[model samples]
Target chain A: KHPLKTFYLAITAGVFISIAFVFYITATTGTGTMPFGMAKLVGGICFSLGLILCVVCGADLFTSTVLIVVAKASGRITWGQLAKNWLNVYFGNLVGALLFVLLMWLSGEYMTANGQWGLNVLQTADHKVHHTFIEAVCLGILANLMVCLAVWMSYSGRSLMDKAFIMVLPVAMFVASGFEHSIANMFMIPMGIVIRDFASPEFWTAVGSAPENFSHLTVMNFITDNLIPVTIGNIIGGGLLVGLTYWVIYLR
Target chain B: HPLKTFYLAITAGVFISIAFVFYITATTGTGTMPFGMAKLVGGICFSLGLILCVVCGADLFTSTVLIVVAKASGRITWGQLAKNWLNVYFGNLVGALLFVLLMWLSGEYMTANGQWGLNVLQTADHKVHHTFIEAVCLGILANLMVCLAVWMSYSGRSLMDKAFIMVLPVAMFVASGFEHSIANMFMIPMGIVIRDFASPEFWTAVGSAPENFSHLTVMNFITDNLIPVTIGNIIGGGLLVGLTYWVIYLR
Candidate 1:
């Protein structure tokens, strides 16, 4: 009935999926499940369930802009009307994901509170993710290409079957290929920060290990390596290639 | 009047918005500005911006399906729409982001010598994120419901307000609940990796760490526990839950 309601639905759905995402990452890192691959499969099922049902049964997703914006171009919506729509939906999606990731960071799910190992692997690998800018840019480009492609495929698909099938190939490629997506960056970057706090000497003193300084370099690592480039790249891919192409085909 | 113009505007807006989404996450995690609770507001804003911009603003996005199979649907003009979309947009997006991140990374905005202290904090105790099997299943259910709801909501909304308000709440909720939507997955997982790499060395020098060939249990701890779970979670959440739910919901 209301765009806010749709926004809320998507927001709620983000929560469910984000949590499962955290769990899956954790389970696999910790080897909580029998087989890590099985854990990944099972985790994928969880995320997909939420995504499919919420969307099909009725919820708004930020990515749907690919569809909604195109509809606006066909005289289906007025210029002023489209502007307002974009404003509201864009704000809604940002709010939804922001809340989802914040709550996750607060929960300390990303922290290594216990003396456990795994989830914080990246934190340990600080030296690597912060390579030369060229390398980071390359990785960033590759990552967003995959992500935007996934979004693009989803946009172009006509039937429900097509959409569902379309979703798998790109997303799978991104995940399997280790590509970056901005939304995932939301949790990953911050989680690293939270995880580090937990590893402090005060936190780990009882475990007989002294806490050490994780260089500020790590935070910069997130910004340069994935955040900025990926975000920019994603926008370009979503708009120019996928969005424009559909605009001409559907409207022109 | 130019499709390209509208496309550029929308893409730029979406990219900036999505980038902010990741920024919000980093802020909240580090206990920076915008507390965790603010994420509710943040997520709502995100979806509102995304939908309104595309619907009312007439910008382009990935979900429109023009980049992939929708070309085969004959809804467009290109022959190999998927490849065209991918090559062009991918290249463009990559180029744009490379410029953006490079500038920021090199600038003084961050503290990590352009690397975010990844070397120091990359390693520490362990476990970047955690979830049970049941959680993954629930996550899928949640997303399935959201994506379907968006499609359904699109059908019902008559005006911009109706669409914007209808969508804002769900998007906010998803963010609040911390469900794994693929985009966020991309951001958080990769962010963590980068963060971890810069965090602190988890393992010491070659001899400082344990030797290999210790046992199956040891190897299991190394590979299965960490690597496989993230992979499984992505597939389960992204493909299985998001995809399958659409199957049933559409039915």
Candidate 2:
């Protein structure tokens, strides 16, 4: 269809991922509630809802959408069209992410868990952005490797429920294993950044942490440390590893 | 196809029994995993059974309940469904029996100072504690997920697609404390054999005695748990999902 429709769907996909991230944050919120592996396992399970909604609803999420590389390789879409699709979806996903973070903040939903939810948001984002550049890229690589595989497997699925069920474990493994998703991080880490920059002191007191504790969530850090490398990693992993590998085996 | 189907169903029984052992080993003797949280891990592990069944094309009874969908649509006669069910169900039992006996002979349940066997005993003891209605309801819920998983996987084209799709549904049933007839078949018997046959030194290591596991018996399993849960499984899988979907789509 038109670029306008494409961009809007990407935006909605970004919003969908953020909602799933919110669910993950909620599931993993409280302290000492469950041990480490179990908690992350549940978080991963909840976060998988992001891709399920995106794919089922026909929204264009960037991680899986990167498989367009395969189509490009097969000479199906022009290089120009591929670039346009990627850029348009990327920016719209960005806009959609910030938009949700703003709304989530306005709703004071972060005040959950006696403000520990906001704290969890900040901590999660800080951890994300603090990864070494190479580490972030590598993590992002492993992350979308699973994402696109889910997409790959989903193509073989026949029904709505099949596609939905097909998405859970691969996505859950990525999140549970602490691999990164740029679109998911686009919402989650930024929500933390928003809380870091503008959360009320009372909320911080409730969270039992200081804003200065999360010094790494700067916008510059978001771009350099997290987004750029992870985006590159997503491209390499999904586009090159999966898309190209399959193309070689089958299409080529 | 008939003999092969029966053989495959038996393999799935072995597969389910293996997964039960994996679940018991993973969850028990871990000192402090929260109740549900531990089951969550064990549940995920236990999903190995269905994953194998789906990917390897083993005919499991809980999943096989969907034959009723064909029956409902009159594409297949009642006799076909009944005979298939009887064969698969019995084959699964024979399969369960062989694996349970193998596990006892291997004595692998003595791992962790008999805590592993103690764990089986504890698990089987608990499995038989449910009321009839509770077992039936749990069976209903359990097979609902199992059958839906199989229904959805029919939409799949490849082994990988069929395999991973089942992980969450089976995990949910195992985690949420739902009743599965085949799982109980493997689980309850393993408990009984361990309680009755494991050496007394095995008990000394776990610091518990066999008399405490008196509830882990064949009669109790048949009366208290399996019969009710199996009835519920049929209602849930065959009627609710199978016939209901057939009515909606086929009729």
Candidate 3:
């Protein structure tokens, strides 16, 4: 009966996460004397807008839900229940991420900053696809570790302002430091694929870069190069490093 | 009965100033981004300081004016209102100044190839140079948004909720080029110190310009900027926003 509700929540989380990309592109796109580190720092703060929405609005994020490990560890939920929840929400997140990309495509907002925005999206994806499996997995572990920590800190806050402050530092650190989050990637990598395969010729013209710049950005490459490895790392980081550690200290 | 409240108010002022320093550093560099958008981003960074203050339970003067509305509505006595206002006023001023001293000593103001530290001084000088009427109008606009942010915050039940809620309006006001009294308290004095105490060689190296900041005297800051800005803050935040809201919602 509640399956649809869960599905909608997952979609909400996905869409919320993708919105951060819009702000990130806006803040990071133009050339400036802003150091790469500080630029990333600024981008990280903008991206926190998404997680703030997800947490405040009470949506189910898979990375954050790795807290289910604590529930399972505490014997509060069965293994079957955990698996069912993860599978259901993971697919929902995918749908939401895709849906948002489609909306952006339809809205033609990718044409922003004289089509440089779309180019930024493509460049970001190219960078992501080039990361080795080990790097992707390690980044994934680190990203979700910070993300879950933000979620943990959020629990301690009694007001939304406190929760937001808690969310900002961790989210910004992960993003600025070049960590990879699965849900964020779900939006980012796929958006690149869309722009490469589906965007207007004017986009390529405006970007002024060769198609060779994005030759490595393929669907198969995304799956093998980033998604599979990063997802595994996220589970370990969120489940073992954070959830299990907390469980050992508090629950066990 | 309320010394704790005064302390919290001071802490709130200190945090707000630190946040401004973060924003000044973040925005004052050689980035080639569009000017308007960069300012907006800088403004967003500035919002984080107020979030720190609000979440930690600091009584900012702009927000505390909401109590005036309550008193006018007969929810409290005039004496109570005046006492609360005086306590918060003194606390916020001290906190803002202390934070400026900390920033000066930490040497963070000297970062960004020394361009950043000079940027703070220039910014503070520019703020102080505004005419009385301009300062009044800017303060009006600044406090309205701040008070609105505080009012919106009362409806929030969770920390994340409050933080998300607080970010937007505050960012808008700062980015929109409005002025707040508490923020200026920190900025203007720090600028004066950098100008007055720092050696000419050091100032010239960092500032890359003549010592024009000598004009930013404390007397000038008070007469030209703060007094006018504070009066406007009371009118805008206390009378215009808080009282109007009380009239509409409660009266």
Candidate 4:
């Protein structure tokens, strides 16, 4: 089953998406002239690198793995196999996300943009925890609808470049419209929580934000408010909206 | 090739203008992306024009100029080439004009709290005010990417192969401030069309100075952006990418 390889690939995929979040943070922050929408627009485009890297380099996240619904319907893959694949990839991606956070925390990348980057990460993560449960759920649906759609189209592409271009617009729209993505949040939200709990004194002063301001970005809050609801919606949207829909329309 | 190019070229113009409409919608708001970054987003959207033209069977003047490749290889007559250029050029212009009317009647310019039309006017006047030489150089820069995008895409056997090939180069051209005549045929005139017809309340909301946009006249646009960028398109796409490749690849 190459179970270890799948886990390893998911780790690298997690790092790739996290690096893209860094790229978006750097690009969007300290940009005085860019408004919220356009800033998000650029951030979204930057975020496309995450899926592009995943597809070309070999990995799939839990949300995209939900497309296993099709194979299950076709009798080619069992529900047990589906659950195993999702669990392995999900845990691996989390490990990778935490691993990268460790590297970033020690490496002082969060202190970038004269601490503005770190500040942006904290505020950005805090905002995620503020979303209402239903809002987070629906936003997750819209998010993976775009993500799965991107994965779906990549099926049609013949080359790395083909898949790369196909993924950009859809990913860009999701990020620009501020849709919730669980895998990306795996890196982004925790990174915020890490900085909030562990940042140095100079880090706080340089970015000029009180740690208490982002108090809601706790581990439990991230789990309850964002991760669980978002995970449920990702399954519905990718599993049902795309996987089941395609199965019924074509296979049945 | 010459006589029947009207419908095909007309579709291309419509496609390019629609893409520009997306470009405006994308870059219209003044929020957080940097100036160049926003341009990058809009420019990427504008690549939809050439992608549609190459994939969907529309004849564009920029690519039509690349037919010089066939002429240089002695496969097509000069008469055929000239007429193909002339006819597609006119047809593309008419397509832009027709689209401008639809956008005008629908009053779609009031997008982004009237910033869409304001962005339309801002982009239009900027095009018209360019020096002749700047427009020419910008046009050259623009179609170098356009012609080459179309050229490289020919190597593709699949639809996706060709689609991806054309994107980055065209995106760079538009993002880097290059000019393309067919795209401008819709973009610039759409501004003038909006200016001539937009409601006074729309103007007040955006707080735009109509008098400052005085350069958006029929003759000014023709003399300014149209004539120069069109000349540049030919030289860039024809001599640079087309004939240059003919020499390197065929001769």
Candidate 5:
């Protein structure tokens, strides 16, 4: 319950991150359609602001928080602690997003936004569940790579500003490129579910309505298409790829 | 003078950075701006690009270079060797900006877009002078922090991208919030000065002809306001902040 606070913070960041993605997409679409360099600039600035806000305001990011468990598992921990921290962190992000989306719904902000919020959720889900397995894998890889990279940065320096700067660019790129993050998806996908009119499969089939997304997308899609591989890839790419590299060079 | 070559490279980056700022402002304004997590994503992309260019191309950024003298003073070098190295180093930045500006002014491609470039310079000066002392301090803090972050990130092993990703957000925040650092300010301001008309008063005034602006900004402003503080910041933030943190955490 106590550590779950970090998860809440992470989910809050995820929601806000979604909003930021909306702005970035709009900005990119707006004329000047800035070249790659300029997009990078926008992405970088956004990253710094987000990282600073999360750290200063006390948010739990899975990427950074999860890496702690990884460190501990590899004998980086003293003793008597592992799953407890991971569970707390993971649940925190999950539950936080759950409550946040509910609040957003209750506030009726989504309804008020000309369904802009609703439309965004649908589009994002369509992109996610509709993609081929390879596409999801690639998207998952790219997204988590950015996520882990951001986490790796948070470990770099002491100065508040230094940490913020390190975070800016990578976070920005992930959003700009439309990479899929699992945790962020937790909030968004649920937003889609809640917003959906479909209450139940039995209700739908018995009531004679069309199936709600092939029984809410194949379970295989979650395990094979996304979860297992993306999370694993994220660990390999980020923890092994970036974290170990930083450890050997600077840490060790 | 050779150090200036490095400054020249950074100046190009600054110019590009501001141009991005302008584009964003133009495209997005009003309420409900992009929030935290999203912004972080953008920032990561930015620094990744910056580090790539910086490492591959090599830069003469003042933050890292100035430390050589600090090193020398601490008996890292023999007696009285500091001044020569320091002078050339400082002079190198000035030289680099001068050359970069000259190219921008003289080159046909850049000339076609000269007014835009000049406007960017003017904007930079206006932005810095607008906040005066705060801007200068922030500039100092931002640069020192970023250069050192860059320095720290460079220590990475296998996941070089990881390290690059790590240091970038620090750099991006500075640029976004309008922090004053030597590397970023170098080209933008110098380029502005070059684009302006010159007169007896011009050299002293920094081409700022507005009735409200001080008659002369003075050479002292550059030395007192910019140079020393920026150097101090780099040492304190980059060396003290970064190195100390690493020592504590890793040790």
Candidate 6:
């Protein structure tokens, strides 16, 4: 089994990614003058700050850690160690994401831009859980394929700028293309749940976020509709498509 | 002078053009978002090219002005500096124009359901019309920002740090509507190419007046904009930001 410190690092990575997501949500809000297509591009660029934090600061992202499967296949790591690392990191990341949800709930930051930000959050969550299983799985596959490609590029990056360059374009491409990320969803979906139930009625009324819009945002739906399928897809994309392909070519 | 490599300098121009392409695509067509915000978004997207140039290790004339500061500090010979500058400037010109050719031929400008190519040409036409003084002053400000980004990036130890460092200053310059000579070289020439060569039907469909675009020839481009802007870029990047920083930190 891995030491306790490993889990702590994983939790920190999770917390940082969630915090970055908060910035992504907030930055994308507001009545800024830009074309809608341009706005999406900007929002997508801002969203990359989350992955930049995890990669630069050294975090155990589960999607990234899927590389361990390749290492196991190549005999660089044992199956037992890989399993231990995965379990510890996954739970740690969940704890971190949930903590951020609580903090955002209490902070009232979602009320920014005349509560348009809150509506954006609600819209995002509603859209995520409503995806069909196959769509979510396919998007999840595409998302992690970009993510792992970025991670692979960073390994050869000798300087900080090189790493960031490698990360930004791929991250921007995936997010802008409307792909799904399991960990990012952990924050986005739950935050939607909190806002639907816990935000004041007057606030929701003022923003015109009618109750019917978020009716499907339940814990069961989140798990059944999104999380499970997305996680499975992340493995196939990150592990099979990127990690295994690289391992077979370079390591094998 | 050693014929070290012009390829890296050319690559920088290519990368910068790519970012310009992204900005053009993103910014074309009217929408509901606020103008300031939209402009800022376009600027941020434009920043990707500079980051690519830096990460991949390419020489850009505007950023290379820092070398003059080094020369002034007696760290390199004046002869060496001049050779490097000449090599990068010519390479940047070649690379920028080459990208324009590629993009023009690729028919990427006729995007946004047919409105995008028009926007590109219109933007280039607008740029060439700027007065010499405006172009010079704008070029100064643009190079200052570019130099500062390169300076800040020096402190970064990892890829993320350098990437983030590049985004802010470059975004500021582009969003503020500052002139960049190398960037102008790419768009303005490409605009001329589109007007002169594109089928009259394509031009008519793009809705740009032939009269408005007639003045955008190569001769006018060099005299009206490039010369003044290039001088100002040298002053802003080489003297103001680069020399000033070296004076403060190294002197």
Candidate topping lDDT = 2
lDDT (0 to 1) per candidate: 0.41, 0.76, 0.74, 0.75, 0.46, 0.72
Give the candidate number with the greatest TM-score.
Answer: 2
DockQ for all models: 0.03, 0.02, 0.09, 0.06, 0.02, 0.07
**Per-residue lDDT over A1-252 for candidate 4, one digit per residue giving the tens place of the 0 to 100 score:** 467667766776676577556556655666665578878887777667667656654565666644544644665667787677777888888887787677556545566545777888898898888888899999899998988888878878876567678888998898889888777888889999898887778999988888899879888899999999987777777766655666576865
Shift of residue A77 alpha carbon in model 2, Å: 31
For lDDT, candidate 2 versus 6, the one ahead is 2
Any runs in candidate 1 off by more than 4 Å, and if so which?
A1-3, A6-10, A13-17, A31-54, A57-61, A64-68, A71-94, A101-118, A121-166, A199-225, A247-252, B1-251
Candidate 4 CAPRI category = incorrect
Residue B181's lDDT within candidate 2 is: 91
Scoring only chain A, what TM-score does candidate 1 earn? 0.61
Supply candidate 6's per-residue lDDT for A37: 61
Order the candidates by lDDT, highest first: 2, 4, 3, 6, 5, 1
Q: Which lDDT tens digits does candidate 3 get at residues A115-218?
A: 77777788888888788889899988999999988887788877667767788899989898989888888889988888888768887888787567789889
* Worst 10-residue lDDT window, candidate 4 chain A: A65-74
Which regions of candidate 4 fall more than 4 Å away from where they truly are? A1-252, B1-3, B241-246, B249-251
User: Which DockQ-derived CAPRI band holds candidate 1?
Assistant: incorrect
Error of 3 at A201 (Å): 3.2
My TM-score estimates for the predictions, one after another, are 0.40, 0.56, 0.55, 0.52, 0.41, 0.52
Tens-place lDDT digits, model 2, residues A123-198? 8888888788899899889998998888878877786657777778998888989997898888988898889888
Q: What is the TM-score of chain B alone in each candidate?
A: 0.42, 0.92, 0.90, 0.93, 0.53, 0.90
